[PDB]
Amino acid sequence: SKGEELFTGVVPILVELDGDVNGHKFSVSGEGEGDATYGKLTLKFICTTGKLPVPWPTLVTTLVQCFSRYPDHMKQHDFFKSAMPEGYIQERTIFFKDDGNYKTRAEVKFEGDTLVNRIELKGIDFKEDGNILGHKLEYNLPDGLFNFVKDAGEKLWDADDQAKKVQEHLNKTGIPDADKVNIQIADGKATVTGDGLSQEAKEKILVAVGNISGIASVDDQVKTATPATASQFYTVKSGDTLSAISKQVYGNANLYNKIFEANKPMLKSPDKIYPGQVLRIPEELENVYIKADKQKNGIKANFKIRHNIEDGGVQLAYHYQQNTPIGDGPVLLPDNHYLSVQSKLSKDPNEKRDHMVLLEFVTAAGITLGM
Ligand SMILES: [K+]
């Protein structure tokens, strides 16, 4: 198990992708670094040929799982590092439901002190007005400033006494940790400041202040003691039901109670949603499932990605993966396990080329009972 030595600290990363999707050719270069002790990746990608013809999110999985955090009890199962520095070949087919597919072949290996991921991608059969080539997928979840339908929500005053009325509302309705934030109201703009809340507790506070009549935006100045993926925020439409919303955002109405619970105690029952109300849509988690493929000396994985569609819905991307070592030295062939991935996409306001900034955390784990 030599290869783990190479990952004990911060390691620079080069990524190069040459892609052609339905004859639309493009290239991507990536620079940054990974820290496998923390399963952490910090990378920025640039479309070097111009504008990217597909949504950036659809390329994330293709654009170095040797940087996954494998805890001590899991190191027996870390195929990815055991193949270093000679590396591995990583191949996938990605089936976008009701649309085209990507086929990818990548070489992942050290070149000097740098871990390099060189990729060839070919996409075919996509609908030129589909969600992919039509650029209908949301890039990321809005940060920092959240917008609400200004005149929707609880009526706390007619048209610091305003911020006082808000704080009393948060308290009276039972919003957890309302006593750990400070509210400021400036002409339809609320600023919420606080420290050491959960991601979930923060989100419930933000939504409860925004769902007040006369509040058009909420400035999230709240630090979470600990990150974690944010939820989607959904604006209720005339005619909506929680069941129909669930069908759109998750794919089935049978997850409607997931939305209801995630918006308690602000929301008292499924029938009390109203047009213009913002609701938290908690992530439906997807894991990466890995298995060994010994008579090929590597591993297989399967998983799916949920890509949010901008104007409502989810585009599923089914992934099937095979990894084969490049070197002939023995490698670790793991037991069945899974990886848990948290990813955040952002933009450099000063960058002018088509790009993607990526922050990612990945951890390994053993298959659970509920699985
Ligand atoms: K409002």
Author numbering: 3 to 65, 69 to 164, 172 to 383
Text from the published report:
Genetically-encoded fluorescent K+ biosensors are promising tools to further improve our understanding of K+-dependent processes under normal and pathological conditions. Here, we report the crystal structure of a previously reported genetically-encoded fluorescent K+ biosensor, GINKO1, in the K+-bound state.
To better understand the K+-dependent fluorescence response mechanism of GINKO1 and facilitate further engineering, we determined the crystallographic structure of GINKO1 in the K+-bound state at 1.85 Å. Well-diffracting crystals of the unbound state were unattainable. The K+-bound crystal structure revealed the location and coordination geometry of the K+-binding site of Kbp, which was not apparent from the previously reported NMR structure. Notably, the K+ ion is coordinated via 6 backbone carbonyl oxygen atoms (from amino acids V154, K155, A157, G222, I224, and I227). The distances of coordinating carbonyl oxygens to K+ in GINKO1 range from 2.6 to 3.2 Å with a mean value of 2.8 Å, similar to those in KscA (2.70 to 3.08 Å, with a mean value of 2.85 Å), and valinomycin (2.74 to 2.85 Å). One difference is that K+ is coordinated via 8 oxygens from backbone carbonyls in both KcsA and TrkH, and 6 backbone carbonyls in Kbp. The structure further revealed that the K+ binding site is located in the BON domain, close to the interface between the BON and LysM domains. This is consistent with the previous finding that the BON domain binds K+ and the LysM domain stabilizes the K+-bound BON domain. We suspect that fusing Kbp to EGFP constrains the conformational mobility of Kbp, thus increasing the stability of Kbp protein for it to be crystallized as a domain in GINKO1. K356R, a mutation that doubled the fluorescence change ΔF/F0, is located at the interface of the Kbp and EGFP in the GINKO1 structure.
